[PDB]
Design a protein around this ligand. Sequence first.
Ligand SMILES: OC[C@H]1O[C@@](CO)(O[C@H]2O[C@H](CO)[C@@H](O)[C@H](O)[C@H]2O)[C@@H](O)[C@@H]1O
Ligand SMILES: OC[C@H]1O[C@@](CO)(O[C@H]2O[C@H](CO)[C@@H](O)[C@H](O)[C@H]2O)[C@@H](O)[C@@H]1O
Length: 574
Amino acid sequence: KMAFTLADRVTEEMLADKAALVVEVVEENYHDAPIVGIAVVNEHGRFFLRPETALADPQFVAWLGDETKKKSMFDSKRAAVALKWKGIELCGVSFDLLLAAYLLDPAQGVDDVAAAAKMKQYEAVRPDEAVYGKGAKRAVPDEPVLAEHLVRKAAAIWELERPFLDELRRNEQDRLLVELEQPLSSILAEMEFAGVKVDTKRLEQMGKELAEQLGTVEQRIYELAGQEFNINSPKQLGVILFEKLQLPVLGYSTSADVLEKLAPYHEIVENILHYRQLGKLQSTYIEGLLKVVRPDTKKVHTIFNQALTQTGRLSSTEPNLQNIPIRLEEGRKIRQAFVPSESDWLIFAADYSQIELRVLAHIAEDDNLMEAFRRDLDIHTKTAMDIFQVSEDEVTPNMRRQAKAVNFGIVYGISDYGLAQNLNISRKEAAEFIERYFESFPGVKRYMENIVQEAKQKGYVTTLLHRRRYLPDITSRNFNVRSFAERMAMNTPIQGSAADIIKKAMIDLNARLKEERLQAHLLLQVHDELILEAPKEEMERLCRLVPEVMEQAVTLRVPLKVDYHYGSTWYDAK
DNA sequence: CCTGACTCG
DNA sequence: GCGAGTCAGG
Ligand SMILES: OC[C@H]1O[C@@](CO)(O[C@H]2O[C@H](CO)[C@@H](O)[C@H](O)[C@H]2O)[C@@H](O)[C@@H]1O
Ligand SMILES: OC[C@H]1O[C@@](CO)(O[C@H]2O[C@H](CO)[C@@H](O)[C@H](O)[C@H]2O)[C@@H](O)[C@@H]1O
């Protein structure tokens, strides 16, 4: 066993200006959740404190908020938010092991202290899952077992800080941790805690009108099929489409891509696609959303997973506010349900225009692509002009659409198969497009070749701010497995650098909002855009400040461009 | 608990 | 084709 003092009261030696701190929140969703225990490890020793006793002690609380008292933790955002819900401010977190491990190797999927420690051959700590269990069996163990687990985690963090910081320094990722990710952690904490206001009453009205339409398309489907069946059963649907109605096969696959091609054969296909759209808005964006709105404040408090994506992007859960409908008008209406939290306040949204491609232009130093952006040209029309060799005047809607698709392919790691599949054309033709694209953008071609070669030589690829991704399959003798890694080598520096940029913009924006003492604050981040809320009196100032700060986040060989809109609801901010 | 469907940048 | 999360079904 590990030695530790199971304290009954807080003592001075527990308030050293340097310590590994553990403020345990077992619940997955930490919003307004319980803190089941506390552990502190420092010069003087290892201690376990009960929350009701420590969070009531004015000295402990002052220590938690004393920024000069440095704390090392694992997932400090979790503790900070749980503490915000109790009116307690956590300050001075100088090292976060979860974020440190995430920068060192995102593929490891480090989600507990045990996994992080395993990276440095340290195993004197148990995986949280072995302690709390999971699912319907998850539970907080008795004090003895709980206290030892928390102390062991604190002791691990205490021991591992140095080794993790040393490696970060070698990787040139020390500043990435201390100046980007950790400060961002605190900003993400304020955003989650603030939450976003939902107009539940109008959301239930939409759910009512939706319920009526689904009933219509539903019965219309049973008619065209001359039989009732579970439309949501990919298995039952396959029977009705490929057996009863003899539709062509191009069990059974009824993916959206398949049905779009079957549409011309039978009227039922169109209806099944619409029914699926509406059915998705109903189950997820109506019923599912309402399930997570706080009844008392009518707010939803998302949780941004800051150490999950392989590219450095953020992810969002319970609910996922990074995938709210907008493409099809019927689903876009859902956004009229996200409103400001105060009367006379408005929603302000600012987004980078073509940041991936601008980053690509920068990194590849392609003359044509850099010139195009310097002229702030419509990138897809320009790409169409170059690959089809025609004047702007001769670009047809269909040419542009296809040049647009090629730009995606180039960004996601261009491949004969991938483009051909996306445009519903032959590979020989796709290779034809790609071929032409590289003729017009030789710089982009050189980069794709060089980055793949660099991935093979170094073993990984990096982003603008030194985030990295290891690509061991880049040397596989299996074509498919190797090709996956190659695309990643091409795409990660693009998607990854775009992530670094917007993360820094969030940090710069917040320092500016505070300098100006503006009431405006961040609500969400959707990969290449920032959503804020502020009194209407601050709109004119934000119109100049937000774009400015986002455009000046970093300096590239091409300018960064930001569009913005504001309105009464998220929907109107367009 | 795992597909196969949908949603987003 | 790159990166994500949620839900009804089986
Ligand atoms: O607190 C977020 C942080 O925790 C991890 C690991 O514990 O994920 C946990 O919390 C998420 C938000 O509720 C869940 O989606 C996830 O299933 C749960 O393990 C990290 O991945 C994350 O950075
Ligand atoms: O009780 C409803 C009953 O309807 C079936 C078809 O007869 O399913 C329809 O309605 C469901 C919603 O209640 C949808 O999920 C399903 O997609 C639609 O076909 C039966 O499965 C169900 O028992």
